[PDB]
mmCIF file of C-alpha atoms and ligand atoms in Angstrom:
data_model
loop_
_atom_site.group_PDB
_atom_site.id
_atom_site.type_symbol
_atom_site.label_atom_id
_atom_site.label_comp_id
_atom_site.label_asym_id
_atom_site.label_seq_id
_atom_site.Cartn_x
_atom_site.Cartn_y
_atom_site.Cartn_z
ATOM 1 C CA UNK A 1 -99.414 145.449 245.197
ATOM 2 C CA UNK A 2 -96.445 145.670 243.259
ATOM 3 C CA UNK A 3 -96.568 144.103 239.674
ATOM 4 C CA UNK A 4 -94.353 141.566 238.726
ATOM 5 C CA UNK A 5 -93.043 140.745 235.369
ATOM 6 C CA UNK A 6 -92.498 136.984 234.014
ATOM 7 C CA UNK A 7 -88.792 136.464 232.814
ATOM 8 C CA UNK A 8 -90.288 134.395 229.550
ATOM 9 C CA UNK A 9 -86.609 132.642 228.696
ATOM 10 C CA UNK A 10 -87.395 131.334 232.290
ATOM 11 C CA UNK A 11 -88.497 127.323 232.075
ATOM 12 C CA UNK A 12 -90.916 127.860 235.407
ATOM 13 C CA UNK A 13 -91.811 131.582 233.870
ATOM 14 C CA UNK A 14 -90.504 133.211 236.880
ATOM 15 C CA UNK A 15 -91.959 136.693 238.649
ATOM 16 C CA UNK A 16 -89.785 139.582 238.949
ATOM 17 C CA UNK A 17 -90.872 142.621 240.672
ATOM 18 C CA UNK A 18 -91.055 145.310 238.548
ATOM 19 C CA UNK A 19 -89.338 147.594 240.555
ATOM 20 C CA UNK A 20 -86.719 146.567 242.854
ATOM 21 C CA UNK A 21 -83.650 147.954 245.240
ATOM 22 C CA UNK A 22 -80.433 148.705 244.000
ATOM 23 C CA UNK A 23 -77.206 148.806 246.280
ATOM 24 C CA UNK A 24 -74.387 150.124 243.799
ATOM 25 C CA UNK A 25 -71.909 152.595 245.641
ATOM 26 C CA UNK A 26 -73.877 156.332 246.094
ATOM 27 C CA UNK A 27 -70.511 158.809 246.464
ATOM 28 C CA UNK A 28 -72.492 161.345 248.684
ATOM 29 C CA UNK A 29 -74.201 158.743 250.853
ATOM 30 C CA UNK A 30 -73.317 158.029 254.281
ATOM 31 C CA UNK A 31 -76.353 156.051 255.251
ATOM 32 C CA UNK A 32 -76.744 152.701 256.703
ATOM 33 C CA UNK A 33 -77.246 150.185 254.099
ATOM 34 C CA UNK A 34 -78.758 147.680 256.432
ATOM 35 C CA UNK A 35 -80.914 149.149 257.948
ATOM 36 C CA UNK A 36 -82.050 150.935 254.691
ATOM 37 C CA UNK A 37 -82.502 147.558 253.139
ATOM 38 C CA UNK A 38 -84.536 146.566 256.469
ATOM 39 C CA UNK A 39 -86.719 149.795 255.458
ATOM 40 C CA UNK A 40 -87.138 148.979 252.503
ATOM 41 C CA UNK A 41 -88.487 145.429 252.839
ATOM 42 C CA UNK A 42 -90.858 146.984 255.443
ATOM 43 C CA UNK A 43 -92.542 148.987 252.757
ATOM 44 C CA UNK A 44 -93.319 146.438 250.320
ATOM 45 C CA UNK A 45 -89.627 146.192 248.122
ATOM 46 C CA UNK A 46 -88.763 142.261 247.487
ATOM 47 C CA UNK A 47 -86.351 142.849 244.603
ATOM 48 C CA UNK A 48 -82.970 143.734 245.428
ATOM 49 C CA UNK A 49 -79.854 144.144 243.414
ATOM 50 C CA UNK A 50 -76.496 143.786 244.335
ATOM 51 C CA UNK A 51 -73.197 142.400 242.953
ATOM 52 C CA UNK A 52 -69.863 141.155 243.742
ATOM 53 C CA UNK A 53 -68.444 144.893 242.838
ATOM 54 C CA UNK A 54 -70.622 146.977 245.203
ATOM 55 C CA UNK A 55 -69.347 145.815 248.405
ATOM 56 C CA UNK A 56 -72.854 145.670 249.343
ATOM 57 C CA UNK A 57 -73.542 142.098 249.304
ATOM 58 C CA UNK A 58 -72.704 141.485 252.810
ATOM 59 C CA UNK A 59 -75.026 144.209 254.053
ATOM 60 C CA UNK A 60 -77.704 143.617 252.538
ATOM 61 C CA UNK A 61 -77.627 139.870 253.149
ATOM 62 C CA UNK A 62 -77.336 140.449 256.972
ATOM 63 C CA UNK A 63 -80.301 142.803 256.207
ATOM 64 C CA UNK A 64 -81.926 139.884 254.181
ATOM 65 C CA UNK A 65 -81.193 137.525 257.192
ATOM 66 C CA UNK A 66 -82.432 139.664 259.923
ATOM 67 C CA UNK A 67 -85.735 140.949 257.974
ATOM 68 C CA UNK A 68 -86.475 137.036 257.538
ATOM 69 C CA UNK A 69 -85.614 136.064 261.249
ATOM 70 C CA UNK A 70 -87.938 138.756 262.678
ATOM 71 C CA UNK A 71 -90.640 137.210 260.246
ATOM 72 C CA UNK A 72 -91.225 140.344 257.849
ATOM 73 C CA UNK A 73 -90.469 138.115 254.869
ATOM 74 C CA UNK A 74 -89.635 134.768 254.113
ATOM 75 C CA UNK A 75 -87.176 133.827 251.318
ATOM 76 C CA UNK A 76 -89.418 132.447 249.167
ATOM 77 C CA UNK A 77 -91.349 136.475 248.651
ATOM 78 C CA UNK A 78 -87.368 138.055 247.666
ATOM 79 C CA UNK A 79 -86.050 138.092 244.779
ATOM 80 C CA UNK A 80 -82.291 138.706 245.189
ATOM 81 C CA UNK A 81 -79.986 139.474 241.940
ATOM 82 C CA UNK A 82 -75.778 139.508 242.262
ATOM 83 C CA UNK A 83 -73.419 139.607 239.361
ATOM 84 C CA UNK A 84 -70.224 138.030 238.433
ATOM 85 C CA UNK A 85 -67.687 140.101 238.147
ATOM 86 C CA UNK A 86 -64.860 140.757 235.057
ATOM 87 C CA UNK A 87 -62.102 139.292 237.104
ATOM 88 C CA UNK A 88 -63.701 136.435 237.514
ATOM 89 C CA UNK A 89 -65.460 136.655 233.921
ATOM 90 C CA UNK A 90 -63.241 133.416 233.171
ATOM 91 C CA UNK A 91 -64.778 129.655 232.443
ATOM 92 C CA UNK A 92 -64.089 127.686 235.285
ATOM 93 C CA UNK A 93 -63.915 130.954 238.012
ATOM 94 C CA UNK A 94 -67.607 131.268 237.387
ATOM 95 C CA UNK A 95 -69.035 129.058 239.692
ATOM 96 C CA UNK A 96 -66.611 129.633 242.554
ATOM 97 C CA UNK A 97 -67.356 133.169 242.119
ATOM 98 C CA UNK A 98 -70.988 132.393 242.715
ATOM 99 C CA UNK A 99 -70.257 130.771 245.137
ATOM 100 C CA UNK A 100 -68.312 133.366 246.607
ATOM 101 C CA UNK A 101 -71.184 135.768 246.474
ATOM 102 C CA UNK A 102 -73.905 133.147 248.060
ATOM 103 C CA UNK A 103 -71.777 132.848 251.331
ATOM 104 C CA UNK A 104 -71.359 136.486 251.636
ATOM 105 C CA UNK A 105 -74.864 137.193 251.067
ATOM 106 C CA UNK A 106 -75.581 134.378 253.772
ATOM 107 C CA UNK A 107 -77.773 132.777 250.699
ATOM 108 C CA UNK A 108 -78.364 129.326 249.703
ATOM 109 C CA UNK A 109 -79.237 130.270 245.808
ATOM 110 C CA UNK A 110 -79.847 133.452 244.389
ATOM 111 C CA UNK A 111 -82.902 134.205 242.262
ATOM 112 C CA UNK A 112 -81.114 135.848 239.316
ATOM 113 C CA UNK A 113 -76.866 135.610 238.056
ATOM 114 C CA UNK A 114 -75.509 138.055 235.501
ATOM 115 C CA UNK A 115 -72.739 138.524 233.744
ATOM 116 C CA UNK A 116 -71.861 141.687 234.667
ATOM 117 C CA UNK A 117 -69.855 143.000 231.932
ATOM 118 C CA UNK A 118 -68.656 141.470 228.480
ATOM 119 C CA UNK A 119 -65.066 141.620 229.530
ATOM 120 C CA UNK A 120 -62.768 140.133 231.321
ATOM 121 C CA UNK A 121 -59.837 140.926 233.075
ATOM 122 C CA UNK A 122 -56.655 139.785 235.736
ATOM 123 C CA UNK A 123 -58.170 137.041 238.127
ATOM 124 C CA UNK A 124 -57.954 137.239 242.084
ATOM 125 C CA UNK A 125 -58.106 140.717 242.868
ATOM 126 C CA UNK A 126 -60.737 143.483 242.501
ATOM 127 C CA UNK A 127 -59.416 146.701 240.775
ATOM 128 C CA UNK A 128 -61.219 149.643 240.504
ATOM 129 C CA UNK A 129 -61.296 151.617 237.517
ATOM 130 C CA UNK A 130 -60.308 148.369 235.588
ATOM 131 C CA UNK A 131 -56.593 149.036 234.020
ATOM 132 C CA UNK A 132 -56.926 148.313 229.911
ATOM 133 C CA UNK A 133 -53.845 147.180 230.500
ATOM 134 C CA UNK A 134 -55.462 144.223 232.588
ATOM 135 C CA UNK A 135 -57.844 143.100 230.685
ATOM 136 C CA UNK A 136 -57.952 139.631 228.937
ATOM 137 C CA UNK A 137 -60.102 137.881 226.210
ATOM 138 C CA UNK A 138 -63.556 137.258 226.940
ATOM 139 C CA UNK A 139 -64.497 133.530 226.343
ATOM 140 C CA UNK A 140 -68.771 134.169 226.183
ATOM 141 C CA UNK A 141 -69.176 130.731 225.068
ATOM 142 C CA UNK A 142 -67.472 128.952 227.869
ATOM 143 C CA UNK A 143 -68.363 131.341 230.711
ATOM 144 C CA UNK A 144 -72.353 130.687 229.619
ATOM 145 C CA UNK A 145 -71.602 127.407 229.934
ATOM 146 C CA UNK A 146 -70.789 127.533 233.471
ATOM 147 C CA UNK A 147 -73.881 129.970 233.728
ATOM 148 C CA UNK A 148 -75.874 127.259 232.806
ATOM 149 C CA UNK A 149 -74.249 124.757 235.017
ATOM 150 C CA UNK A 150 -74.990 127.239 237.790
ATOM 151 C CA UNK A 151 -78.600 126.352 236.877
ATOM 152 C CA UNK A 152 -78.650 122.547 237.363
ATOM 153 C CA UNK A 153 -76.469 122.963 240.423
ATOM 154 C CA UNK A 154 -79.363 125.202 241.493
ATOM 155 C CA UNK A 155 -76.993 127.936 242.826
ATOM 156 C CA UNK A 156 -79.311 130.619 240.997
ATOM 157 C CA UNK A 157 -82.472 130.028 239.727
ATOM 158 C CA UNK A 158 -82.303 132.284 236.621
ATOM 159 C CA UNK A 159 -79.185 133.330 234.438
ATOM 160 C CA UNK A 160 -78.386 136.771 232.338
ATOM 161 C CA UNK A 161 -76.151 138.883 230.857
ATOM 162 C CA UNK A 162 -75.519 143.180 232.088
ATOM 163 C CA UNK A 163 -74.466 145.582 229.605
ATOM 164 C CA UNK A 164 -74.471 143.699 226.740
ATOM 165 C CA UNK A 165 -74.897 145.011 223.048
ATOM 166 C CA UNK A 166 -77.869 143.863 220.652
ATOM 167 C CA UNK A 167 -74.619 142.351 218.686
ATOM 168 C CA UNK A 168 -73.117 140.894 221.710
ATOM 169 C CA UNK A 169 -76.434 139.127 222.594
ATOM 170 C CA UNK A 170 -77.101 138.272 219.183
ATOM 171 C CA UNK A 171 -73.433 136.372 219.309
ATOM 172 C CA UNK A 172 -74.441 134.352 222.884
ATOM 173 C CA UNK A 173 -77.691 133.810 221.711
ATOM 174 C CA UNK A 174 -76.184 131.609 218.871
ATOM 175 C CA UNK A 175 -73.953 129.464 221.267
ATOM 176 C CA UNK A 176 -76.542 129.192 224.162
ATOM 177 C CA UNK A 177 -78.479 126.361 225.212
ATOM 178 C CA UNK A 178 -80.603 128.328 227.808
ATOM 179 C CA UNK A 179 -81.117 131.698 226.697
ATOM 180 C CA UNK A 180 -80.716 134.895 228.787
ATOM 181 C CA UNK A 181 -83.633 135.411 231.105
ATOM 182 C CA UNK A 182 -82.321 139.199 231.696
ATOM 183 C CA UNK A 183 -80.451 142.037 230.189
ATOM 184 C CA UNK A 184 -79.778 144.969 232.743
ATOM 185 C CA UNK A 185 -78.503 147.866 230.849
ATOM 186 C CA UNK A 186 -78.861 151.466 231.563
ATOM 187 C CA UNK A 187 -81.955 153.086 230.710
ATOM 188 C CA UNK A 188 -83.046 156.280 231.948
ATOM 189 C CA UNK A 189 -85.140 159.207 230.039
ATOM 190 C CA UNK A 190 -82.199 160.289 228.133
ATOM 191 C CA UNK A 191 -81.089 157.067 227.206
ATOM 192 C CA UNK A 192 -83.987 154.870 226.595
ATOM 193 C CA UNK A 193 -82.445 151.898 224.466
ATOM 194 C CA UNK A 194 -85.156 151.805 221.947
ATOM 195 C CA UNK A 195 -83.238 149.327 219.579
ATOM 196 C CA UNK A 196 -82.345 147.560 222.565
ATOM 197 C CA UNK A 197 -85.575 147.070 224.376
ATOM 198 C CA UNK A 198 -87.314 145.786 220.882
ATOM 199 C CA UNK A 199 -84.685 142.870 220.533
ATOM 200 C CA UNK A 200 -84.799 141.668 223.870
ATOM 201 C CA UNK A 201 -88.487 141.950 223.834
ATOM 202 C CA UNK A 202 -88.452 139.988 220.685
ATOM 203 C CA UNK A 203 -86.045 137.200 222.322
ATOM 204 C CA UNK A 204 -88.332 137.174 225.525
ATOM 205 C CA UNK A 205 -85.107 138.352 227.235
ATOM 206 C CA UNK A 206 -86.765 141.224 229.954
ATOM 207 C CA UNK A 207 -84.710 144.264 230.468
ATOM 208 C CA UNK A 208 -83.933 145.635 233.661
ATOM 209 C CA UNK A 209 -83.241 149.356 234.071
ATOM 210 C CA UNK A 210 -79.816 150.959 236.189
ATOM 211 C CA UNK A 211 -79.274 154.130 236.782
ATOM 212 C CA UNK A 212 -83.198 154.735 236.010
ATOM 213 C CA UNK A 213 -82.980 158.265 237.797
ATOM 214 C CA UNK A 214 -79.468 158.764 236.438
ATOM 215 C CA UNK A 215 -77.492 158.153 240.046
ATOM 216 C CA UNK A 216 -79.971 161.538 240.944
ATOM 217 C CA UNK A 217 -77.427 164.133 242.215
ATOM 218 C CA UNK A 218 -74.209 161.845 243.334
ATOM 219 C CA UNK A 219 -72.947 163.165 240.121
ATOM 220 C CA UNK A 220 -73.294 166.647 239.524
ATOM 221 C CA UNK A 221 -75.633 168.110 237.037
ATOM 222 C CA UNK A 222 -78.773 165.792 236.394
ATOM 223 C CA UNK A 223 -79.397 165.915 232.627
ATOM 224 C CA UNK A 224 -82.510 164.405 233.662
ATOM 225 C CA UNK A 225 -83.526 165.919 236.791
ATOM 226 C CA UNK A 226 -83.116 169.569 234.953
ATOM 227 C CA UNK A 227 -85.079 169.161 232.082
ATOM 228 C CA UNK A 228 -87.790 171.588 231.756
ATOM 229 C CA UNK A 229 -89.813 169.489 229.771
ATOM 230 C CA UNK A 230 -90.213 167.301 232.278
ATOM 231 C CA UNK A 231 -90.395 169.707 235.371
ATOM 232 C CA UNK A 232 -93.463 170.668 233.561
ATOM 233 C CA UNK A 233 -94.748 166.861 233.053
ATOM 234 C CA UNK A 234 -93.713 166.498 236.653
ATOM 235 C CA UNK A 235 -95.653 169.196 237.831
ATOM 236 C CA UNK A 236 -98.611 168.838 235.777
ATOM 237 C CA UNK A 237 -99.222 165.353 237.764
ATOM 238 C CA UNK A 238 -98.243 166.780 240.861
ATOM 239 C CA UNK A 239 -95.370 163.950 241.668
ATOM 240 C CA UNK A 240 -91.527 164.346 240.751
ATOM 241 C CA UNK A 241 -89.445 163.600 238.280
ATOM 242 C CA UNK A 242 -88.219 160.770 239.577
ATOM 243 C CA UNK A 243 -91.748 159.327 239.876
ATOM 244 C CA UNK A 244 -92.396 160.408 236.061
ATOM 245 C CA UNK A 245 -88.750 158.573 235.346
ATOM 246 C CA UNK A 246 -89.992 155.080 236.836
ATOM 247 C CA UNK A 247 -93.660 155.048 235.470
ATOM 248 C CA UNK A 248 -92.578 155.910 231.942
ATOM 249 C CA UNK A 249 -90.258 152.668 232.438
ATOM 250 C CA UNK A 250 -92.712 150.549 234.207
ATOM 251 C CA UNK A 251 -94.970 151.663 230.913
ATOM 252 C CA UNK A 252 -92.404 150.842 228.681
ATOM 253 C CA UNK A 253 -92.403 146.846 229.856
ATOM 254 C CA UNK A 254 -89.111 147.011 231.254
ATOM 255 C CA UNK A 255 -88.173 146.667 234.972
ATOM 256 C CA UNK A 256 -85.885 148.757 236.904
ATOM 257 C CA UNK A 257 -83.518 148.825 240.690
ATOM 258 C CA UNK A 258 -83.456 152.865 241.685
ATOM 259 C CA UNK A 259 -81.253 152.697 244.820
ATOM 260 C CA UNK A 260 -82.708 155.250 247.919
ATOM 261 C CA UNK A 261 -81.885 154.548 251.033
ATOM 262 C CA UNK A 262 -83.478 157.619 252.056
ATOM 263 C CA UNK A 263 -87.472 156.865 253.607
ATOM 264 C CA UNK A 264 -89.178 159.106 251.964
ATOM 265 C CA UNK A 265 -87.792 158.722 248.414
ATOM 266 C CA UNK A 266 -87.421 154.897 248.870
ATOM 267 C CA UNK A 267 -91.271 155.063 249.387
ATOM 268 C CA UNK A 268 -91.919 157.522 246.707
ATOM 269 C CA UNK A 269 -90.069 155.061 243.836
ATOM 270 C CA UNK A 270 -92.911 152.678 244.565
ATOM 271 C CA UNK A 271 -96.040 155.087 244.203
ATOM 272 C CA UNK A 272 -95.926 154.827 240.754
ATOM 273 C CA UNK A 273 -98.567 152.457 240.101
ATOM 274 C CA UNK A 274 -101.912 154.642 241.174
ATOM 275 C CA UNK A 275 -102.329 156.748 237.983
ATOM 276 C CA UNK A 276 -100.358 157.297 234.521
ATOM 277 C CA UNK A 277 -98.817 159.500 231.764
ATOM 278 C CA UNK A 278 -100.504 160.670 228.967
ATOM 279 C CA UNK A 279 -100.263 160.077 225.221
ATOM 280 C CA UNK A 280 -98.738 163.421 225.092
ATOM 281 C CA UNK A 281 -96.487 162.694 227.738
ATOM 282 C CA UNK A 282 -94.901 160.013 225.609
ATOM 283 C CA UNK A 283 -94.696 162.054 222.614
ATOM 284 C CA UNK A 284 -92.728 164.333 223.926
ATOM 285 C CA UNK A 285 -90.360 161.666 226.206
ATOM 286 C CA UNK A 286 -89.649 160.481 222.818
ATOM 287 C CA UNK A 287 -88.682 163.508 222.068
ATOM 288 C CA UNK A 288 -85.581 163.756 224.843
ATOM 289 C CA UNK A 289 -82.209 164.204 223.837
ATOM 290 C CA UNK A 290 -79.869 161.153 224.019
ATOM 291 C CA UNK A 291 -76.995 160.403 226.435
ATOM 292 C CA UNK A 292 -75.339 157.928 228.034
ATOM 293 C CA UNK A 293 -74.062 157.952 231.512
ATOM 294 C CA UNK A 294 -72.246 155.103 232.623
ATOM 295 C CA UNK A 295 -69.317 154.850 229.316
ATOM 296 C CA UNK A 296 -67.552 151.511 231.542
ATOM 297 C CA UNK A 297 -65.365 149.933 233.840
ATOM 298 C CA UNK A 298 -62.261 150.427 232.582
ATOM 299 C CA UNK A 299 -59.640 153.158 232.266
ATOM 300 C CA UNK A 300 -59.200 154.168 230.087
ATOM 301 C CA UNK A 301 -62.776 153.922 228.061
ATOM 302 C CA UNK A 302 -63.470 151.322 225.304
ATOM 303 C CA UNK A 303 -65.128 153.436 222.345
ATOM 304 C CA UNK A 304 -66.656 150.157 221.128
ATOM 305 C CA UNK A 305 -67.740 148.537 224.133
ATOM 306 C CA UNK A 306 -71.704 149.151 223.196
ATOM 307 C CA UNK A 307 -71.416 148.411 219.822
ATOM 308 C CA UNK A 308 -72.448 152.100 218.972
HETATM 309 N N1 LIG B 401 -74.964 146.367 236.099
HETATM 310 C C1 LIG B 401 -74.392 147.582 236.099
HETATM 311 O O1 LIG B 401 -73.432 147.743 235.337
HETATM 312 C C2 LIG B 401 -74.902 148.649 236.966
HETATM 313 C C3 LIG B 401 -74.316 149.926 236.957
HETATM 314 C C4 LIG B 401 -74.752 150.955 237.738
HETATM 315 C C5 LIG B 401 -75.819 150.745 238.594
HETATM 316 N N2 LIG B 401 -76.450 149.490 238.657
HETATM 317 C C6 LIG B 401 -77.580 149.148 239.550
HETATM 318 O O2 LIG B 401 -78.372 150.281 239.985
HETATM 319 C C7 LIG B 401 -78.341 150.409 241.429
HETATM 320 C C8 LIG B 401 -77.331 151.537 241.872
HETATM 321 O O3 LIG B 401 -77.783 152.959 241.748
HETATM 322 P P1 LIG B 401 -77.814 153.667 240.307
HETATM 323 O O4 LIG B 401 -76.504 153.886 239.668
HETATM 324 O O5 LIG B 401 -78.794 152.791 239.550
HETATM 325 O O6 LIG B 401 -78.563 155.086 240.356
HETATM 326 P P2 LIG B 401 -80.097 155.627 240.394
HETATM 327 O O7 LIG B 401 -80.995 154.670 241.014
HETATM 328 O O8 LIG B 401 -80.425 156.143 239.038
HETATM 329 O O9 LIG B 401 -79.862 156.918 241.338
HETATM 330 C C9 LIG B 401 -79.522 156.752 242.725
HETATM 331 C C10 LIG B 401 -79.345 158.112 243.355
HETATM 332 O O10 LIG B 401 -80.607 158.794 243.276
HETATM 333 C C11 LIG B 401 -81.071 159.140 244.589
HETATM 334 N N3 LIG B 401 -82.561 158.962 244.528
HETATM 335 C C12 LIG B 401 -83.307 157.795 244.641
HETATM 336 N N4 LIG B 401 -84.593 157.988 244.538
HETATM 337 C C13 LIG B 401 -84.726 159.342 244.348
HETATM 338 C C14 LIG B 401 -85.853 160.168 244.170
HETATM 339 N N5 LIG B 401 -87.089 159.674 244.168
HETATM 340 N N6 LIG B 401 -85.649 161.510 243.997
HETATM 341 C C15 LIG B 401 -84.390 162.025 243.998
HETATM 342 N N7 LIG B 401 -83.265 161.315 244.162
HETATM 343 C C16 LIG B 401 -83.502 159.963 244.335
HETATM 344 C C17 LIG B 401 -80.320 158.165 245.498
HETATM 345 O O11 LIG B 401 -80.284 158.549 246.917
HETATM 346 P P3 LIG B 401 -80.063 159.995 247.591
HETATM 347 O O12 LIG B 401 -80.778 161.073 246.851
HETATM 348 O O13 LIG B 401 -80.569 159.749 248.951
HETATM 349 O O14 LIG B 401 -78.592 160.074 247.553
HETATM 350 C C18 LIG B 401 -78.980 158.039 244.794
HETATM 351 O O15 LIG B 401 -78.060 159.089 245.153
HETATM 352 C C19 LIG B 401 -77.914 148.980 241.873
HETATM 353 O O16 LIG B 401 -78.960 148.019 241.964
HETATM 354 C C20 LIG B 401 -76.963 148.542 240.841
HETATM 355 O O17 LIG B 401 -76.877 147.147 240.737
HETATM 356 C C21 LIG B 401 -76.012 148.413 237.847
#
């Protein structure tokens, strides 16, 4: 079975599958998302991840819909995450937004909200790279607000944040009521968020991993997939990088959504819970040089949009 974690800032302590199915944009992929989704929930997945941004919510929920219609899973056993995006990062868009997202996804509540970035920027119309020139003040206090509303109007059943700094949480944390239940950053085995990871851990806030395989090879060069360190702690287990990527994660406490809508590899990021690495292994994972992949949304880049 498939572990799940329990989102502590949660008041009914709910179960997240540690691993789950992400749906952000792949640039090399021309496969069907539906039917990947479909595939997926056949082998065992329950967590998926979408968000307003991907243009995958309307896939996968006629995925979600069909998969539960044909009885190989009821609602109740998936977990389904969206976000709100920075156009609509604005008090009273929030909920509409939601809203928004639940009748694409042909949803009645989702399981998990987030805030998908700590911006915000020109309402009503979805821009891709984000324009600096766009962008608008973020008001955390009175979007969380409507977060939290979300929560007694039982439109989502858990609310968090996405990308957000230890000094960025630190700041919402000091104006919310119900604290974040989830922080999904990127973590991957060259950027591993060790400051991170230890203050969400200490706030019962659970981190969930993106780009956990580093978008694989939709972007060139794989800083991950290349190192020879890990080719060799790869091939010492006899699985793949990849596999060596998610268990070091699932080790770490953390959750994560790789996105494969290929059969074999979807099935692969799941056989991960069998066997483990070794106390060397994790010496010398510590040991990786650090790099971030994913700098933002915008165009062009905010230097100080991490805090670091
Ligand atoms: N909140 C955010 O700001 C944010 C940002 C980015 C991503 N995400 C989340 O992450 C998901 C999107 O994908 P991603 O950016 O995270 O990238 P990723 O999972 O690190 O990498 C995905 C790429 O790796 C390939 N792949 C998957 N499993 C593999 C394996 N075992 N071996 C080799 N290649 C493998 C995929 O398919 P192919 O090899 O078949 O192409 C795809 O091209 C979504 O759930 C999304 O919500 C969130």
């Amino acid at each position: 079975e498939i572990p799940t974690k329990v989102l502590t800032n949660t008041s009914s302590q709910l179960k997240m599958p540690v691993v789950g199915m992400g749906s952000a944009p792949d640039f090399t992929c021309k496969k069907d998302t539906k039917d990947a989704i479909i595939e997926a929930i056949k082998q065992g997945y329950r967590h998926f991840d979408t968000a307003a941004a991907y243009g995958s919510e309307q896939a996968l929920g006629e995925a979600l819909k069909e998969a539960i219609e044909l009885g190989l899973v009821t609602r109740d056993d998936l977990f389904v995450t969206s976000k709100l995006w920075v156009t609509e990062n604005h008090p009273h868009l929030v909920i509409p937004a939601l809203q928004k997202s639940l009748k694409t996804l042909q949803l009645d509540y989702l399981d998990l909200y987030l805030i998908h970035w700590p911006l915000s920027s020109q309402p009503g119309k979805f821009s891709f790279p984000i324009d600096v020139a766009d962008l608008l003040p973020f008001d955390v206090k009175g979007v969380w607000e409507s977060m939290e509303e979300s929560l007694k109007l039982g439109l989502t059943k858990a609310i968090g944040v996405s990308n957000f700094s230890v000094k960025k949480l630190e700041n919402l944390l000091s104006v919310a009521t119900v604290l974040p239940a989830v922080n999904q950053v990127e973590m991957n085995l060259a950027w591993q968020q060790k400051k991170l990871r230890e203050f969400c851990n200490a706030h019962g806030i659970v981190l969930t991993a993106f780009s956990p395989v580093r978008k694989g090879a939709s972007r060139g060069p794989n800083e991950v997939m290349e190192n020879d360190m890990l080719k060799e702690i790869a091939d010492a287990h006899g699985k793949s990088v990849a596999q060596i990527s998610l268990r070091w994660l699932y080790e770490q406490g953390v959750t994560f959504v790789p996105k494969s809508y290929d059969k074999e590899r979807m099935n692969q990021n799941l056989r991960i819970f069998d066997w483990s690495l070794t106390k060397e292994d994790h010496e010398k994972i510590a040991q990786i040089k650090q790099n971030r992949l994913i700098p933002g949304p915008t165009k062009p880049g905010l230097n100080d949009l991490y805090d670091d």
